[PDB]
Amino acid sequence: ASGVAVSDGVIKVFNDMKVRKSSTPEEVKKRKKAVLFCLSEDKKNIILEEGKEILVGDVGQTVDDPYATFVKMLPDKDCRYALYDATYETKESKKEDLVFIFWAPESAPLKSKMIYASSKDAIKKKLTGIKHELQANCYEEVKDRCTLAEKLGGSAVISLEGKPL
Amino acid sequence: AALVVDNGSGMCKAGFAGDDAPRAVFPSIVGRPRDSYVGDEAQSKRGILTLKYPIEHGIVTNWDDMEKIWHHTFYNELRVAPEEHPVLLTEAPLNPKANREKMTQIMFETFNTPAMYVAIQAVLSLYASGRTTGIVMDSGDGVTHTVPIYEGYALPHAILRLDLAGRDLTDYLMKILTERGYSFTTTAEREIVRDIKEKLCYVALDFEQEMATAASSSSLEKSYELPDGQVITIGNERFRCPEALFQPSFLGMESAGIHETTFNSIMKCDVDIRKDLYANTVLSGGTTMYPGIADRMQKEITALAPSTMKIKIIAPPERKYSVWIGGSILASLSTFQQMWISKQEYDESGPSIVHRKCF
Amino acid sequence: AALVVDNGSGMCKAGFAGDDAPRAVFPSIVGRPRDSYVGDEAQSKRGILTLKYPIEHGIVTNWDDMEKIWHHTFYNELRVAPEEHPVLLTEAPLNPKANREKMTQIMFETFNTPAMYVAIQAVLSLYASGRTTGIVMDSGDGVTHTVPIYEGYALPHAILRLDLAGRDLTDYLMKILTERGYSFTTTAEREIVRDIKEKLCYVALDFEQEMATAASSSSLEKSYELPDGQVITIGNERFRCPEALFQPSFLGMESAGIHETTFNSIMKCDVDIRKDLYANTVLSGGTTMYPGIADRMQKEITALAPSTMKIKIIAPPERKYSVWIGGSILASLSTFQQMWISKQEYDESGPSIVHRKCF
Amino acid sequence: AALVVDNGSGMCKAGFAGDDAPRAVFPSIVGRPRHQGVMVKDSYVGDEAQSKRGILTLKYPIEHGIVTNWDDMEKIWHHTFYNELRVAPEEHPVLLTEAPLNPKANREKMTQIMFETFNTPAMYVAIQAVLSLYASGRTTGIVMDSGDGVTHTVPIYEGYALPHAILRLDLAGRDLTDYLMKILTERGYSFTTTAEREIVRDIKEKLCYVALDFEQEMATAASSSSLEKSYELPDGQVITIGNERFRCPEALFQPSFLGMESAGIHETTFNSIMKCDVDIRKDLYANTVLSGGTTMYPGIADRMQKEITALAPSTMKIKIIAPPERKYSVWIGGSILASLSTFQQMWISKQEYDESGPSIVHRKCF
Amino acid sequence: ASGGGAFLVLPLSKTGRIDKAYPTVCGHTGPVLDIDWCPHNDEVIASGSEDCTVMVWQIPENGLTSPLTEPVVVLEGHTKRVGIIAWHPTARNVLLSAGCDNVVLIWNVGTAEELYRLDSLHPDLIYNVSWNHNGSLFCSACKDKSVRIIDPRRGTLVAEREKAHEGARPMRAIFLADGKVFTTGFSRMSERQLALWDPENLEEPMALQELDSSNGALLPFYDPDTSVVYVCGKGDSSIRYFEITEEPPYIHFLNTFTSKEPQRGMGSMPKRGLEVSKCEIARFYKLHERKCEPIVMTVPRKSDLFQDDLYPDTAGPEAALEAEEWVSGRDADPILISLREAYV
Amino acid sequence: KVVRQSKFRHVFGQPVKNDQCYEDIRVSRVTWDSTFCAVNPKFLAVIVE
Numbered sequence A: 001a002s003g004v005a006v007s008d009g010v011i012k013v014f015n016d017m018k019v020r021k022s023s024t025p026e027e028v029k030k031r032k033k034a035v036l037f038c039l040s041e042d043k044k045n046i047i048l049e050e051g052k053e054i055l056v057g058d059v060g061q062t063v064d065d066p067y068a069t070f071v072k073m074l075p076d077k078d079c080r081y082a083l084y085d086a087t088y089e090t091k092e093s094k095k096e097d098l099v100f101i102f103w104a105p106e107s108a109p110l111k112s113k114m115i116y117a118s119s120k121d122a123i124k125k126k127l128t129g130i131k132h133e134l135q136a137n138c139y140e141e142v143k144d145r146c147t148l149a150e151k152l153g154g155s156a157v158i159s160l161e162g163k164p165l
Numbered sequence B, C: 001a002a003l004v005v006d007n008g009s010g011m012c013k014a015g016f017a018g019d020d021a022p023r024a025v026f027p028s029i030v031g032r033p034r035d036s037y038v039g040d041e042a043q044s045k046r047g048i049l050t051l052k053y054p055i056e057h058g059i060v061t062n063w064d065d066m067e068k069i070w071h072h073t074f075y076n077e078l079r080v081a082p083e084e085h086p087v088l089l090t091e092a093p094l095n096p097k098a099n100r101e102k103m104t105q106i107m108f109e110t111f112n113t114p115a116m117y118v119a120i121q122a123v124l125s126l127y128a129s130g131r132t133t134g135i136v137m138d139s140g141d142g143v144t145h146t147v148p149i150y151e152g153y154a155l156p157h158a159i160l161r162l163d164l165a166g167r168d169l170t171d172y173l174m175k176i177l178t179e180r181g182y183s184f185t186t187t188a189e190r191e192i193v194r195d196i197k198e199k200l201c202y203v204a205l206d207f208e209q210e211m212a213t214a215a216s217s218s219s220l221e222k223s224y225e226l227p228d229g230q231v232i233t234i235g236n237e238r239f240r241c242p243e244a245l246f247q248p249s250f251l252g253m254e255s256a257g258i259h260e261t262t263f264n265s266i267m268k269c270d271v272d273i274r275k276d277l278y279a280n281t282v283l284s285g286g287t288t289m290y291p292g293i294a295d296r297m298q299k300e301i302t303a304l305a306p307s308t309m310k311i312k313i314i315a316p317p318e319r320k321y322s323v324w325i326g327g328s329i330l331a332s333l334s335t336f337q338q339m340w341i342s343k344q345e346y347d348e349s350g351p352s353i354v355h356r357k358c359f
Numbered sequence D: 001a002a003l004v005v006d007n008g009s010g011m012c013k014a015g016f017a018g019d020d021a022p023r024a025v026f027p028s029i030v031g032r033p034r035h036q037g038v039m040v041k042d043s044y045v046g047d048e049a050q051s052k053r054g055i056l057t058l059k060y061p062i063e064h065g066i067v068t069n070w071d072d073m074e075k076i077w078h079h080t081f082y083n084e085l086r087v088a089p090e091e092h093p094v095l096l097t098e099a100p101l102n103p104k105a106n107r108e109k110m111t112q113i114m115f116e117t118f119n120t121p122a123m124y125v126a127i128q129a130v131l132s133l134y135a136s137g138r139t140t141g142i143v144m145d146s147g148d149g150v151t152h153t154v155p156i157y158e159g160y161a162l163p164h165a166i167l168r169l170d171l172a173g174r175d176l177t178d179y180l181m182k183i184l185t186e187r188g189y190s191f192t193t194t195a196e197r198e199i200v201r202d203i204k205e206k207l208c209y210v211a212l213d214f215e216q217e218m219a220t221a222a223s224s225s226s227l228e229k230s231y232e233l234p235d236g237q238v239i240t241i242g243n244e245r246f247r248c249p250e251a252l253f254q255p256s257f258l259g260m261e262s263a264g265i266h267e268t269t270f271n272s273i274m275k276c277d278v279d280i281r282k283d284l285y286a287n288t289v290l291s292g293g294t295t296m297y298p299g300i301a302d303r304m305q306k307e308i309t310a311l312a313p314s315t316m317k318i319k320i321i322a323p324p325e326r327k328y329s330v331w332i333g334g335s336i337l338a339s340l341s342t343f344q345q346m347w348i349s350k351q352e353y354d355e356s357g358p359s360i361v362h363r364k365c366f
Numbered sequence E: 001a002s003g004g005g006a007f008l009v010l011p012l013s014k015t016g017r018i019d020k021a022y023p024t025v026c027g028h029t030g031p032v033l034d035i036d037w038c039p040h041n042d043e044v045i046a047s048g049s050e051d052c053t054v055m056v057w058q059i060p061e062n063g064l065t066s067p068l069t070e071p072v073v074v075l076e077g078h079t080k081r082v083g084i085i086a087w088h089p090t091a092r093n094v095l096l097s098a099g100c101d102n103v104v105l106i107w108n109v110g111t112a113e114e115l116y117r118l119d120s121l122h123p124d125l126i127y128n129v130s131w132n133h134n135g136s137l138f139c140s141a142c143k144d145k146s147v148r149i150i151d152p153r154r155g156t157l158v159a160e161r162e163k164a165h166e167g168a169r170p171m172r173a174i175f176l177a178d179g180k181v182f183t184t185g186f187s188r189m190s191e192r193q194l195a196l197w198d199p200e201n202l203e204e205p206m207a208l209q210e211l212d213s214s215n216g217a218l219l220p221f222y223d224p225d226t227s228v229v230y231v232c233g234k235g236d237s238s239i240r241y242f243e244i245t246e247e248p249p250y251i252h253f254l255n256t257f258t259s260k261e262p263q264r265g266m267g268s269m270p271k272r273g274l275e276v277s278k279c280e281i282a283r284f285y286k287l288h289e290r291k292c293e294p295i296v297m298t299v300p301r302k303s304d305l306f307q308d309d310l311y312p313d314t315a316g317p318e319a320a321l322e323a324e325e326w327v328s329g330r331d332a333d334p335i336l337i338s339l340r341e342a343y344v
Numbered sequence F: 001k002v003v004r005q006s007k008f009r010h011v012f013g014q015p016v017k018n019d020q021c022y023e024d025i026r027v028s029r030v031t032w033d034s035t036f037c038a039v040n041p042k043f044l045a046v047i048v049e
């Protein structure tokens, strides 16, 4: 426990991303498909990484595969916290669930890996309702679609983001 | 955009009206330390807490825990605000009238739902099969109900309840798996045993003949892979576990099997409708998804019913979620919007309005 | 400026928070005549004294000698007054609750530290690697620990302890170095053998093939220069000394190797998390610093784990002092200030405060 | 003269029917040398392996009531008949005991070994819990048999067993022995080898007891030295243990000390009774019988009485029956049963088994 | 197997962990007791089971892809379980089967015929049967403590020795290349013993050496080329090998391989499969309860060249006679091959 | 010697399946203590009310 707090901006974004309110399709296009969390400059609060996010409206027009693009914004030599809204279909239901992703590559500096790992259990407790966790320590554990599909429902998942595995 | 919630005995089915399958299917349990975890969250922590079933046998017993499950369904599973969508609830047969009003009070005062409708699970299964008269053998998680229905109205005096369902079969599967040297005891290994039951178990047409075949060859053996990579093999346990449905003495229970419960409930009805109920026996619930269960039920009931009666067991391929699918289509109809219990109608009549609007 | 003290079984690592490497690394020994000498001074006098390890196996057994080590650490090694800096202490896994309070009382009453904190050595190593779940194979000087950790909490029931580490390998290297005609028996010659072990020894991927290679040619022979100028040559002893880690039978020990200890501790965890532990095996400690040990551990565990299991051994290049570096970065955080146990808090709750602030 | 053989996970009790105590009680271990002989027997069984354990690797053929090595199991039987009892197994009928809910495959191997390897003229397999109630002279009661491998709670009412209400707990004397080793290292004593496991087991059998109130007992030991006892190691050193005396047996009531998700023996016994019919729970509450060596801790009956009455309704009379000879209750009950004139109709002859197979053994048994 | 009986057949290259769902030869309705490969066909194996039937199987070249349930032949001539099966060393498609009904049957695998029936020669349970060098006679160890030498073609008892071993524990009896019989058994004190017998004079054994006082029958593995017999006891963790020579005491103890794990079974690869280039004279597949661990027996030699003395000519995979010719009474030695081409 | 020599000490009874029985037979209610049934390898005779 490093004592790093979660900023009010992160809580509001997760609260909006968790529950869906009845809204016009223009506002539905503004829903966040993925978003990245990073440490502040003073390393005191967990804040939103500006510009590194995917909107629901962006999917299908500019972004072909939301997961393929989501992996790309992950830095190669830095640790990040990710919130990916996964849309997958198993053998008997179509599911839409939140996935909290801990990106800690081996190439990341030692100080970054230590703080992110030590404060992960503190931020995860503030983001109540998340039933899915993905801890990736290298690019090969996060780029493959079957890796998320294996975590979400194991072999029961037959489709991910509208595309068969 | 309506919500359909099927409060099952052990599994809660939830989704949106107009969808083919429920969006969220999670266990209906509340966990407290041996501070409150509901659904899969209470299962991920495993054995540190103790688990309680508020609707253990179709009838809600702990209303405070039931509100937590409903709170978990709307906000965490369906990810919607209940005050913006009408919610269609389902209830077990022989549900006391006090429970119907309590559900009415909870929906409008705790969740402030704009509208609500309450339907009987057994009737919805029969409608989804295109029938108005028949007997629905609903075998769920914690309770098995045989509900004879005539012209869309269940006969309460002929409804029989059996406390023998998938939950008891899952526990029986551990007790027989330990005979092969495996050891499944913790709640974590309960879901592995449940997954084995749902994938490799089947109902044998002739149990005694199937036992001889399994003891003379290995053609019935199947292999299953544990999460940690270990592979286990099960043989005659494939058809011994679901055999407890037809022979409850395997679990030490005195009650009769599902075939005799179906026949006994039919004999409690009027003589002039018994012929119709014999040919319109509809299966429902998760516990009726074992391959070969429709053939076994046909063979068993025929041996009980008169030889001049024509027996047809109806097992639709989607009978696992027929209650929810039947409720989802009904809630999505434009003509059904006049059948809701509006909040304005709730303030004038109180919780008692559910008796005259949903029967 | 906070202090980070890593009281290891055979080496004491001390320094200031925010630094990349510990300032002082000295043996944790106290010497008495066959009047009290601590640290490298106790080794400078060589054989006149008798040496004792108060923390011989990760757990403090002589608190009087432990205070001498800490007093020597602050005043002679760190060269600061302990009453002006907060001190972060580290403890071995399965450390008894009585030892945590004894450490708290000593640090606040004998040294009058303004603040104090206790952290688990295994958890800091896992955090330094950027992980919260996994198994840490901490092999130090006098003890080797396999600590499976889930969500930042070590599982006490699944921790396995092996009394086989660099101290035993150093003694083993002496015994096999006498087979070449060399003689290392004195305490002064012990540090030479330890130096030889750290610079020339490596783990062979296949021991039998490597033994045949060294017996047919001279490509594996290395030369080492003694402090007095004599040059010695070691051949197959380079990979025979660290081989005792995977074959404790070389030392006459009945216990299993570090590869089997790692596998056994994983098998003592829940079946659900065994998949995560296999792919998150983290190495730590000075004994692990042999080249080629990660590849040998990967091969040995794979032959034990199921073929469908995906095995990775994590060997960070700075795993020798990952416990200290993980503690130094954590203690230097401005958001870690509120986590310290202040002297005002100690005066109210007594030594028992450490259980609720440091878990 | 019939033989009564009670194979446990830790100890093997053997004797003759009609006697009051087992004639031969030896550990069920097989030891093999782990060094190289330099001066001009590849395995040792029983007490012989216990006296040479300094250079042997001790292994238990049974772990958690499961035979992990049937080749070593035959050594235990061979040592029992020829070295301890010093009798010919082909001249005396053998009455064996089996754990409750024993797999049929395990029972099939036992009868096949006795009839084909040892050539016993007759044989019978009885439930250990049923025999434990014979020794106490009862036909009704719930037996809480806790030994070395596993703990069982078998409710019996008027001679009728309820298999659906039988509960198993994977926690026994061996788990406590391993737990005692783990907590002994906190005091500075290290016991790692299999030979040192027996030393720690002897410590547990002599200085461990069950505290009536665990939290109060912890406070007493943390402020006084009256609870500290001394034990002499085989080679001469003396060790002193404080709170470890009652912390080791306490894992029986709080298995969370071992990282186990199951409930204690007090709750397992209560849960087994609640699985029975309502009308018979009254007789089981007043006839709770303790069996096995794991129930020989001082004060365990008082703690078991105190814990159950907190679970049972206030109007119920909880009576824990703990006979002073409950370590051999299974054997003593077997000796009584084997001496009955009306038991002679239950013997399974060797000739009958050769023509009918193991089907006749699954019948005539429970 | 959960039901019936089966035996796992896998190629030697398929090492490592074996899938629990790997196809097996599951055709018997009872547990399988004995298996034996065809010496003249590396793809034909005969199995005996509790169901009183002997089944001959054909193994595909690449192994099993699906479970094999249909055998080539089903030999049904026994009233009780068949636990003994011994192929003829020279005659093609001639098989011996001995069951618990104390009857010995000579089969013709090619035509599924019962060549001979020997039923009134063993008054008790038969322990093992071994052919002689040329396949004309076979020795058998019986439960009545008697060792018998029987000619199957004439149905006569060539030689017989009562009370070969005084113990009541099971004993074995195999034929040697020079015409002697090697027996392992128990004494009255129940001490495991080894004995050498000359059929021409069975009054007293040539040798009688005691090994230990442990349980479990001793299974001997004879190597005709090296005249070395390996004594492998069921339940023992050690392998003892002895050399049989014409010098007294005719049984010379060589050494003992010691391990820490008891064995459940053992099989020995024939000479044609040994790595000759590594001075390999025997390879034993020791069976644990859940693992098959090969054991390599090597002669320590400095030279890396071919050792002519260590590898004489051995019996080849080519049948000497045919099934029909052997009934007439023809006797011929096994066709010998060389081991030199297999040197690498 | 231990066990009395016999062949039928392990004979067990097993009723046939429900499809092999004879249902809907109004068996006689006479208090007379007879077998009420006579069967040969061909027919089955039952006294009825």
Ligand SMILES: Nc1ncnc2c1ncn2[C@@H]1O[C@H](COP(=O)(O)OP(=O)(O)O)[C@@H](O)[C@H]1O
Residues within 6 Å of the ligand: B007, B008, B009, B010, B011, B012, B139, B140, B141, B142, B143, B166, B167, B170, B194, B197, B198, B199, B284, B285, B286, B287, B288, B289, B290, B320
């Ligand atoms: N394919 C299947 N085969 C057999 N049993 C199943 C299958 N799928 C689900 N089940 C069983 O159905 C039970 C509950 O299903 P459900 O009918 O939804 O119960 P409820 O109506 O009480 O929620 C579960 O305990 C599960 O074991």
Ligand SMILES: Nc1ncnc2c1ncn2[C@@H]1O[C@H](COP(=O)(O)OP(=O)(O)O)[C@@H](O)[C@H]1O
Residues within 6 Å of the ligand: C007, C008, C009, C010, C011, C012, C139, C140, C141, C142, C143, C166, C167, C170, C194, C197, C198, C199, C285, C286, C287, C288, C289, C290, C320
């Ligand atoms: N480069 C190296 N290679 C092999 N062993 C090493 C190396 N560096 C240190 N060691 C060994 O590590 C041991 C102690 O390291 P450390 O992890 O600090 O122990 P502890 O954690 O018990 O203080 C020493 O005995 C030394 O022999």
Ligand SMILES: Nc1ncnc2c1ncn2[C@@H]1O[C@H](COP(=O)(O)OP(=O)(O)O)[C@@H](O)[C@H]1O
Residues within 6 Å of the ligand: D007, D008, D009, D010, D011, D012, D146, D147, D148, D149, D173, D174, D201, D204, D205, D206, D208, D291, D292, D293, D294, D295, D296, D297, D327
């Ligand atoms: N006086 C005692 N106090 C505490 N434990 C005991 C005592 N006597 C025996 N035990 C324990 O009981 C365990 C098993 O005894 P037993 O009932 O013979 O087991 P089993 O039924 O497997 O033979 C032993 O491991 C031993 O540690």
Ligand SMILES: [Mg+2]
Residues within 6 Å of the ligand: B007, B008, B009, B121, B140, B285, B323
């Ligand atoms: Mg339902």
Ligand SMILES: [Mg+2]
Residues within 6 Å of the ligand: C007, C008, C009, C121, C140, C285, C323
């Ligand atoms: Mg350390």
Ligand SMILES: [Mg+2]
Residues within 6 Å of the ligand: D007, D008, D009, D128, D147, D292, D330
């Ligand atoms: Mg016992």
